[PDB]
Automatic annotation (TrEMBL), chain B:
The protein's assembly and partners: Associates with stalled 50S ribosomal subunits. Binds to RqcP.
Signal peptide boundaries: none
Name of the protein: Rqc2 homolog RqcH
Organism the protein comes from: Streptococcus suis
UniProt function note: Key component of the ribosome quality control system (RQC), a ribosome-associated complex that mediates the extraction of incompletely synthesized nascent chains from stalled ribosomes and their subsequent degradation. RqcH recruits Ala-charged tRNA, and with RqcP directs the elongation of stalled nascent chains on 50S ribosomal subunits, leading to non-templated C-terminal alanine extensions (Ala tail). The Ala tail promotes nascent chain degradation. May add between 1 and at least 8 Ala residues. Binds to stalled 50S ribosomal subunits.
Domain of life of the source: Bacteria
Coiled-coil boundaries: 4-38, 52-79
Lineage: Bacteria, Bacillati, Bacillota, Bacilli, Lactobacillales
Location of this fragment in the whole protein: 272 to 552 of 552
Recorded family membership: Belongs to the NEMF family.
Amino acid sequence: RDRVAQQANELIKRVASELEKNRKKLIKQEQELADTETAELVRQKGEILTTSQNAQRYFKKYQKLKEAVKHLTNLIEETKSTIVYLESVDTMLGQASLAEIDEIREELIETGYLKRRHREKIHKRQKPERYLATDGKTIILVGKNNLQNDELTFKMAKKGELWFHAKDIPGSHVVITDNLDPSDEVKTDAAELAAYFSKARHSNLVQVDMIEAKKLHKPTGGKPGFVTYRGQKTLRVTPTEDKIKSMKI
Amino acid sequence: DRVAQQANELIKRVASELEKNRKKLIKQEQELADTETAELVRQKGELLSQNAQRYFKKYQKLKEAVKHLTNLIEETKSTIVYLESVDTMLGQASLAEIDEIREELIETGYLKRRHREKIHKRQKPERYLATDGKTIILVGKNNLQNDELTFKMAKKGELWFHAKDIPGSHVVITDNLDPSDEVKTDAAELAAYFSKARHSNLVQVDMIEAKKLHKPTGGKPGFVTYRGQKTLRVTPTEDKIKSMKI
């Protein structure tokens, strides 16, 4: 097919339009929240002052406003978590081969951003990409989309196996396999795979988090790839295209 | 001791991103060059388990990746160009105007509004009075104003100015459909002054009706497209610019 890259292009433009729409949506929601009449009504009708004793009108507003503000706060938090999820897709998208893009399409179908098309094939879901560390023994696994990310982290990872992710920015989940106490050389390799496969690819001294995989928590209803953890160690590495390629199986 | 320091981190941030994308650009161009081994494939197919077809299909697939890689490269270039425009607006802006440039960076995804940080109202383009003392010229002081001025505020017939091939403000002559060459020179001087070419002589600026400008779908704030424009060569003077300030 001579449309494969073109379709990869529409998909990329598609994800960006979603980011754009949700960012515009976020400022609208935050604006609405700031433009909301402050509820303290207990202020305009703690008035004990006789002067229809028609104050009730305001007590009932205090309640409607405290609730609207709560609701709007909830909506705003969901918009943000959508933006964070779409951002992770945009990152995976920009660093993917055409083949890996077929699987990210499947993710977008599952998360509701795309519908399969009339009589379009179903791309079989692949396993995380495997790497061989500089020690020449240890296998390191890297998720290439959020479905592989969740799978690697919550299905494939054993107890004791260490997990890596670039700190506070979108990127792949990275797990060290079959080595429960790795050298600082193997840890560094893993952290470098994490920093390389992230939004911080072409920058120096990237922070990556290191913590046992079994310590990660996926909140109920969380979007693919999103995780939670505390008490992690942090490393600072500088990924190199050569270094990464030397570990590529 | 915060307001300027925040103006400073913001300035350092755009610079880091530029550096990051330029490194990314060379890497992508390198990969694109290391991909020329595909001609080989096409040639052994050309000249002809071991079919002439096995080589044709290898080559069509390699050729699709080349296309994908080209699309990615164009995407990195347009990011750099966009970030370069922010870098230019940033270095010529007052602190007040920097609050609006922050709102643009929140919108294009480079900043996230912080805990309980206010929402700065978006302002209108800056107004200047041409040497004829009658005509109003408008100047975008950022890309949201650039877009607004060009695609929202500008009427039919109104002329639009921008420094040729370099980052700068959008400039529009207001309520004068046939301006004198004195008025055209003023507007171009504002465009050249409010650009990356501020302290240089003979700046080329493009002149064309605003309603002939097209913002490509998915295009970044400020970015536009046109053909068949006139060009002028002007030399901005800080005094001249100040005299036209309302």
